Amino acid sequence: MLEQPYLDLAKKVLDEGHFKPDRTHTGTYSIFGHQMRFDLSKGFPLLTTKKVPFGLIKSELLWFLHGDTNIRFLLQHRNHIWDEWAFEKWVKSDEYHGPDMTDFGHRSQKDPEFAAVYHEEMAKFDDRVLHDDAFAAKYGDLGLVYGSQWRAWHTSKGDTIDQLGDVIEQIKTHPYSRRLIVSAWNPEDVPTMALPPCHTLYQFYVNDGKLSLQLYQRSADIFLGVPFNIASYALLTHLVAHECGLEVGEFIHTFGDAHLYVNHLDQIKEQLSRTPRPAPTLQLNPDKHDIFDFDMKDIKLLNYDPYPAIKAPVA
Amino acid sequence: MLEQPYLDLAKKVLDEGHFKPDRTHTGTYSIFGHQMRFDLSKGFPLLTTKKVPFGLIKSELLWFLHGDTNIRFLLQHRNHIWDEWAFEKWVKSDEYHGPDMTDFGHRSQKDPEFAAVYHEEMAKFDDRVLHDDAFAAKYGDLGLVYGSQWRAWHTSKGDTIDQLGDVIEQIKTHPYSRRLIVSAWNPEDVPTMALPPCHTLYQFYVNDGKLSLQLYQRSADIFLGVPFNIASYALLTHLVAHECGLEVGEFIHTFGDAHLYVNHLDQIKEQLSRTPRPAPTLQLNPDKHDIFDFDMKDIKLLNYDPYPAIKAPVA
Numbered sequence A, B: 001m002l003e004q005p006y007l008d009l010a011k012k013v014l015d016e017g018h019f020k021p022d023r024t025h026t027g028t029y030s031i032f033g034h035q036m037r038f039d040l041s042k043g044f045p046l047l048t049t050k051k052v053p054f055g056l057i058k059s060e061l062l063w064f065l066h067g068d069t070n071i072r073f074l075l076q077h078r079n080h081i082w083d084e085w086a087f088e089k090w091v092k093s094d095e096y097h098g099p100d101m102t103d104f105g106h107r108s109q110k111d112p113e114f115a116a117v118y119h120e121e122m123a124k125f126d127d128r129v130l131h132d133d134a135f136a137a138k139y140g141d142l143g144l145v146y147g148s149q150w151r152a153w154h155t156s157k158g159d160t161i162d163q164l165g166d167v168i169e170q171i172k173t174h175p176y177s178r179r180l181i182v183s184a185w186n187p188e189d190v191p192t193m194a195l196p197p198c199h200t201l202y203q204f205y206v207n208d209g210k211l212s213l214q215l216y217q218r219s220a221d222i223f224l225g226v227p228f229n230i231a232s233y234a235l236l237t238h239l240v241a242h243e244c245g246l247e248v249g250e251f252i253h254t255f256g257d258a259h260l261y262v263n264h265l266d267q268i269k270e271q272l273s274r275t276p277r278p279a280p281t282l283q284l285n286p287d288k289h290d291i292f293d294f295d296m297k298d299i300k301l302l303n304y305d306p307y308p309a310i311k312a313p314v315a
């Protein structure tokens, strides 16, 4: 059905998987080079064989579209995906006096109480960001995330480029350009970076009255991370169709290392026995139109009827 | 056989082609999103159903690998592909006194003698670049081509980054990195550019002892331009295997708008009736090893037995 392209992508790695060590050797089955297409006029690519939080997808897409870099917008939308990127530098200088949280990702995972001390000093940190302009301003700002790469590229001779906002004036005035790319990869500040962008680039395209978008994902954690990535970029494809006064066609996901983290093998076999359900259908607020100054309430998901959720081990 | 992935890519555009105007409306049949793989241990992807100049492929790849930007290296290797990018600014100021060559690409195409005056003032220009250091230095330097993007990215706080030379120290010391990308797309100087890079990026990958490379081509002229692109990047895949002391696996070509220029339809039907011949096999000089300071003589093609050539109308 609509997601069938996803569930085969997980079976091919279950058959071509080269075991590849990486991580800290930790374990992967991977393929290199894969492309899967979703026809967004049949429905929205949110999985029906795992319940995926559409709420944490739109909160983050609209952080991206507002051009935002600050953990504070996400936290005051209960969406906590980016938190330890900034809870990481909290565990760094000056005011960091007290607990350990020392490359903590490792020890909460293996912990009775290392994790709860991790878990509390983190909400200490979080309801701080929510509450003082100076802490928030200092440590809640990640610097180089997608809102800053998409809406403010940093130039020599200091400017900021709005990459997004210029390819959409470009899709309004020249529908047939093959130069409609946004690149989240700047190669200058990429070794001075903690997580090199994974959505490296995407490219839109107008065929007869309708818009599509293709994405180069440099590395994708098949089970835990692709469920979420398919709907973030098939959301943005509906939103820029919205603003360009166009119709909606295809979302093409193309992949570099597509992998299955090894600690995740029993779980993805379980969803692999489930049978699809019909996918939801997304509609968007008709009367506001500039997506950049949209809020949660203008995006709704109807008839999402998921299977239950499959809980992680994480990546 | 080995190239069979190419000839089907031309038949799918002959069946899915949306006619798309572009050019100056001029004419195209295109698809959006396509991926074709070549297993480089069966042989080299140079077409056997068109004779493709392996000589103009390696001259240009080694310009790229030397980090060169100057029409002069290519001209003193009889390879003239980049010439009118710099013959274009010749038709610009100061010393440009005399002929017309005014967006000339158009009028030589439709010309009795507009073209020969185009054709002579161009060799005037060419054996000039070959002969004075100042003209050559001034107009034979294109500025932003692949040697300058691959081997000298331009940073804020003026440096130049060697993108290539760092991912190969990276493939020698960390074979399993999914962050091995080179991007030829800088989004700052891309509207102040005549031809936005078409090979936007590529990404290498080490699976068990062997190297592969995947390429995102933003726009590719199926008949006249892909024959050449497959062997330029499947050359570079053999050359960096060479230097990393590794083996050779796959070349994955992934595509954005793959198109068939309309003036080219009878010609690509003709090659489409030909039957493959076995592809050549490339060997490289064993005893020199740093590819960056290689010359023509270290790359040889054996048993290339092509069909005849199919002459263009151009793109």
Ligand SMILES: O=c1ccn(C2C[C@H](O)[C@@H](COP(=O)(O)O)O2)c(=O)[nH]1
Binding pocket: A195, A196, A198, A218, A219, A220, A221, A224, A225, A226, A228, A229, A315, B178, B179
């Ligand atoms: O939603 C997400 C989150 C993470 N990753 C990945 C891919 C790898 O598992 C890891 C990044 O590691 P590198 O590929 O950058 O080493 O995170 C995704 O693909 N999607």
Ligand SMILES: O=c1ccn(C2C[C@H](O)[C@@H](COP(=O)(O)O)O2)c(=O)[nH]1
Binding pocket: A178, A179, B195, B196, B198, B218, B219, B220, B221, B224, B225, B226, B228, B229, B315
């Ligand atoms: O060897 C080549 C030469 C040119 N092009 C292309 C693609 C388009 O035909 C044109 C570039 O036009 P834009 O896509 O940049 O508009 O040149 C290639 O793909 N390969």
